[model samples]
Target: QPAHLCFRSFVEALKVDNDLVEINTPIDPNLEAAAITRRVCETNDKAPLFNNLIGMKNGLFRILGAPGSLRKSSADRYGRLARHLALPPTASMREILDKMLSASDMPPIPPTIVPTGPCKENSLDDSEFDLTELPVPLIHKSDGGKYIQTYGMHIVQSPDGTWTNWSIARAMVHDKNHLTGLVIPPQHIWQIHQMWKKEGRSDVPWALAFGVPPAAIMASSMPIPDGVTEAGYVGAMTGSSLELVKCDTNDLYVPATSEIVLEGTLSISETGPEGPFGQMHGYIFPGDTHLGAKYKVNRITYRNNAIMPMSSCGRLTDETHTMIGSLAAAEIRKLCQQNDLPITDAFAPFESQVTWVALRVDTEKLRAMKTTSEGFRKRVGDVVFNHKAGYTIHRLVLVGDDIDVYEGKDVLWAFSTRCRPGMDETLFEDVRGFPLIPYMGHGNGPAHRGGKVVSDALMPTEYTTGRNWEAADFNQSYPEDLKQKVLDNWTKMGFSHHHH
Candidate 1:
């Protein structure tokens, strides 16, 4: 069986090293907790354990912000994601990508139903509940309100019960009994809301689970199919079933170990202006627009000393572009494969900050199919842009196998050398794009479909066939004897370096 660990499992796996900063002192949502978490992301420090959240009526609940560090070595850079997939503790990037891309091919595995779990230890009914008392942090300086579940997963099902989707969108607290934010139309939640609307119900039953099983959270970020049961793929990834408990107010199931659960019906008819909050693009929407509003916080439930997670909005480093965007890239690759496009490996390098993704294809296979560069680029862009994940991407990079699409340096080098301005870049017209992206949102217009570029970074046919061409840094020039001699004498020569 694949290794299985829940929320508490990760904490136990690590020894209580001195590196962990345990704050017994309570911190306010206004400046205290937000300030410390901002520094943690900015400095890339060890995750902070905020044991005290001011204004929380319940006992102290721990919060860990910026859980994944960008500076992690590639070997274990994806450890948190690995644990979520139920793989061995030391899974690598390639392994994690493989687990996600291949999940579509597996049979959907439904979650095992359980009678009860720790999440239900305490339940708050209407008369006894008040959200204003909970320590919900207003994460950004220029913001609308406190967002309690930006990182949590929202579950919604189709009206006919044909599809169930778990997705990550923003939500914030309102008053003692309400929470409100975005749930834009034509999206999964809105589609589900429409189902409830047709039935003459104003709201749809919903479940928001925070501090979910680590694997479950990772799965939530991936753009899996609409009808697919992510619980099964999550189980398959971990090699064990994800145990679940049904909601008290509805039949929906939630992760058994969830730290907190908000069970209520999402109102489809009501909405108000929601933004001016900092987004992944590192800018806030200056103009106010209609956004989903919260009302009637019917029930709240939690485990003792419940821990609520936090995600401070900012530039590229947050989970928005890193975790969720990368996962979306993987799903797009699967979609391309399903459409029979000659895709080998695909990645959205970190430098794009998740908005630009590069797809590397086996050029020879395409050549055999008599595919033209223009045709391939147009088709690829159109297919991706029209899909769900494409809703977030503004730029797409297409490269050959020779390029290391995963590395920003390598992708940039390839584009600089092979990309010709105006001729190679292909853009689509009238296609919807990510409005949050500075270039698309603030720039001239989408007509810059002329602006989108896809460099054919593959070696020209003549270049590959000619021996007189480019010399490789490692294989073509370096002598084996000289390299080995340099390596063998390095430590002996007192050039000290530690081998892990």
Candidate 2:
């Protein structure tokens, strides 16, 4: 973020910084590109702009992968959230999270409706558009089909037209006239579809927007209360009105400067099998279909020479891990804040593949309130499992204010030592969750009921007064200089890279 900056302008941001390493090497769009992106995210590579995808068609688009690849500090990676607010790129995730949560306090600035913008650069009607023409990436060899969108926000309205929802859901190219994917009936999109069915409307108009404001994109990931319009919150988050342009085939207004927009309708009577595609859980279900929940595309539109952002779904560091999992962290944080919990921070780590979300709470306040272990565990489970953040999350870890929620090793340690599976774990039964999870499938039952658990990883009440067991690590109670020396001389110690 800088003065009058947008997310797409970050190519300029990287260019402006001489320290960023730009790999001009041509990368293939097939498994080769996914392999490169996977390694880059693992090694913390700069945002790589793939100019020549292996099988991508000309005039289709360029691909930007791992926009939020982790770095040593937030300043390096925080630009993903900073761009939308027009703030400096050096902003911290703590600052970004605070600004995001403060949206409820800001005055709503309704969008400044406009006649048109870049998204209208190229338009195609129902009879003319071709989805196959776009450079849809065959992310993985095992993938069922080419997936054109992994980071776009989908727009849908309630049957009464009083509420609008913007959310992130996976979609893959089916043909020239359809993008097949899941519309989990338990999600907000599913609820909206049910409303349309109730009203006897077989189809509902929809729009998919990509390369809009980063804040808007992030807002789409938030699990805001149902029936609340995302537009107002988006405006509040960015401190300015969202400039909108009307859709070619519908009344919906998308970000005027969006890189691409797909206008279509979800049919109630029409059903299509849409999966066996790569999922966010870092595993392929081989051939699972979301029957009766298909999204049929009627048109495709975009700016000239657009840069289509695609999330290579596989092991990790893809959009599913970076966007969906990171956003789930914010959702859990919001859920805690709304419920008057003492949560200070939270994160859904990429290593966990969106299965686990961690919460960091103020220990002093916890001690002051004298919260009982059972009471805290049950309350935490109830709050997360029944809410929006809870929809995709199966495992929740509760940590004290002292722990770093972003550190996976730290969380694992707490779970291993402090949480007893049957005693400290609080299981939430019969709640619906994302279909992507491995445990939710049949063998359990045809109608899956998700099991939720909150491990009280925080120290027991008696440990508050220095009565806890001492950790067995040599560094836990050691001097900082010793740890620094080891980190500084890792390579010198005959190690290529710190594996653990």
Candidate 3:
């Protein structure tokens, strides 16, 4: 949005801000490129753009790993996220969410179709469309195959061509031309595939575009309800229509400035063993080999200096959790507001990997309801679990207004001190969850259906009556005069005021 129309422009902005580190040094495609990225994600270092690969030509394609990983410096921890959304580098989480919520309210401006763009500079059809030649890194050590489509957007339309859905789904290269990935049930992509199947079609037309616009990528990661296209949300976010171009082999529209595009069809009947990869949950399901829906690439189109951005997903929070988690949190907040729930802030912590959704209660409004702990908990649970996005969220941590949901320390403090094992926790049955959830396969409730828990981390008195106590932290414990005095003379006193 800050003059960043595509991934190239976003990288240019990072370069200007000195947040991107270019490595001209040669690295192996198998593990080295991904290992460096994993280290970057763990350490919160500069984003790396690898210019050379061991077995490939220098300019044929480049590898950008950890494209939007967090920064080490506390002052710029959210710099990557802020840049991607066109916000100030020092913007707060609330500011970013506020912008997203506001943007979603605007009418969607559909994408503009262009005849051709940089992505069409080079084209390959049939035998020339070899995905094995690209430097698609084997991201995790436990991964089944080289996943070339981590950050790419898959464009698929309904059988009637009325609804087009663009989403981010992982696909690993099984051979020179075939990619094996999950087209799981209940998801938009799978739903469209089902439409094709119902119509007696064996395969569904698709396009996978990589290195798209920053706004477009963020929009794709959002788990919005069906029928709400990401293109409209993207338009609202960028304040302009995205320039799209038709794929050479399909009617699907792809970003005109994308670095690479794969025109393909996803087979409905065919299935391959595609998993055991390290998932976004920071764990690998060893023996659970998903029946991967085969995607055969018939054509490959790319820019002259194409770049494939790889998401090194494992162990810690990468872009998969940060960008997607933040957007999910925003959507949850919007959902709560629409239902008149007194929730002030909502966040899915990166540490939880989307498993736990935290919602901060508005004390004044909650107190007015005069409901018991059980009554309030059931109400909140019903509102959250009944929603479409709730299917992916497994747990809910209800925090008081005092705690910041985004801060790990605050959330953990609430969980440790306020939550009671049996007294405060309640479970919901008859609700389905994503099958990838470890507990979903053999859960206590039913086969393939996992139960969700809602834990009250708030003190009972706060809801039953009201807060008769104050926090003991420095910011909350001291008088305003004393606090202001310390803040004003902090540098003069001995402690540095860097955090202030």
Candidate 4:
């Protein structure tokens, strides 16, 4: 079995699998490091482990670039993502999603508290720490500042301490001991912050953990239901209670084996400019600054030779796509399953930058219901649009089970071949969407409700009669024996084996 649930083991596994490359040469933390990472994402290169940096202090931090990006060196396209979930490196996208959705059906295993852990090996208090002096990367040249909390999990709890939210949010290095980040309403982090505000607290206790267990990172990114702590679900997913150690300065806890932890309080009153960083939407418009909550760093703890994992959150195929996209798909499937919908799977093609969520429908089940395309579209629209996952959803495409949403080409081909321009699409102009989508927020004002359409890519006849037309592709059109014969003779015939 893979030991990927532990953050350290995941890195070692990647190294062993030839998916990680360690660079002993000093790297410039300012922009060189992040720029190289950005290229690595698009190129599908191995994750870079920067062992040396300019202006290094105390042999302190190492950077793991493109930590969750796709790996092309393995048989599976989603090899790195599969390994992170403790599945075989050769696991298919469907199997990877099935693993994540399975957690919803299991009982929460909750975390086990321990007295101390690796993160406590070294420490620094308020007066001795200077966050601005650290090697935080300027992810993009247009970024307002260096963001240190890209892939880190931010831990916050309700005022009563019953609901702890482990979530991913960008936080920039503000000054010597402060970091500024988003604390908006609706997200669990802000929801907990409001709870503290309502109780007359000046700030909310917070802890940002980096290089945590792989399972914990997945749960942190998942769009799980409200009031549910991410830690317990992580335990459920990993089939074991994750050990956590209490933060030195706060009541909150972090993964025991975490590489680094910054314990502090998020200010409720004071806020600072936080953005213009290249975001998940793949844009960093100059001067697009928003005043976000500020965090007061009271304590810093890390194990010796600590590693900080970061996602170059631009374009696609980074952690922003793999981590968030994977869970978003699982969340939609879980939601659909609970509602007894015909959707068998859900996925957002990374190339689309999460603009569209494609759902695989069980046509046999649809035919059993004896429903019209319009009626079925309406039902799907109502269920998904009203769902919690619906908030981030820009558009949804519905396809038959034969379509594979994981492959970008397959989905778009289905969209173009099956969807009718005017009639097949059901447009809803009222539902609220994630505003970061370039056109949604920047295009107009007052009406933030961007029009969302459920493009029914399913052929009308197929809903009742099933697929009468067969695909003309090699695998679909050729006889199995003939295909095997061709594949077997390809190498002897002096042809490439890429297709096989």
Candidate with the greatest lDDT versus the true structure = 4
**What are the TM-scores, per candidate, against the unseen true structure?**
0.90, 0.87, 0.94, 0.95
Could you tally the backbone clashes for each prediction? 5, 1, 0, 0
Per-residue CA lDDT of model 4 for 1-500, tens digit only, reads: 23555687888988987888899999988988898899999889899888897655864588999987887653666878877787888888888878777778789998999999888999988877788778888889989888888888999988877898999988999899999987664578888888888888468888999999987887788889898889988888888888999998778899988899999899878899888788777987899898898999999999888889988878876888887776787788778878888888888887678778899999899888888878888888888777666767777889998898877889999999998987998987777767777877776643357567888999876778888878999988999999999999998999863322
The pairs that clash in candidate 4 are none
Residues 1-500 of candidate 3: C-alpha lDDT, one tens digit per residue: 34357788788888888888899888987989999999999888889988877765534578888876787777778887787778898878888777667666788888899999989999888866567787778887778888888898999998887788888889999888899997875678888999998888458999999998877787788777787777877887778898999998888899999998999899878888798778777777667677788999999888887888889987676887787777778888888878887899998877677778899999888888888778778888888877766767888899888889999778888887898987998888766666666667534546445478889998978876777678888888999999999999998988863343
Off by over 4 Å in 2: 1-7, 17-32, 53-58, 71-90, 442-447, 462-500
lDDT of 2 by residue, 169-223 (tens): 7778777888776677567888898898889846888999877666777777677
State each model's C-alpha RMSD to the native.
3.1, 4.1, 2.2, 2.1
* Candidate 1: stretches off by over 4 Å: 1-5, 14-20, 69-71, 88-90, 285-289, 293-295, 446-453, 462-476, 486-500
lDDT against the true structure, each candidate? 0.69, 0.71, 0.82, 0.84
On lDDT, the stronger of 3 and 4 is 4
Q: For residue 85, what is the lDDT in candidate 4?
A: 85
lDDT of 2: 0.71
Clashing pairs in 3: none
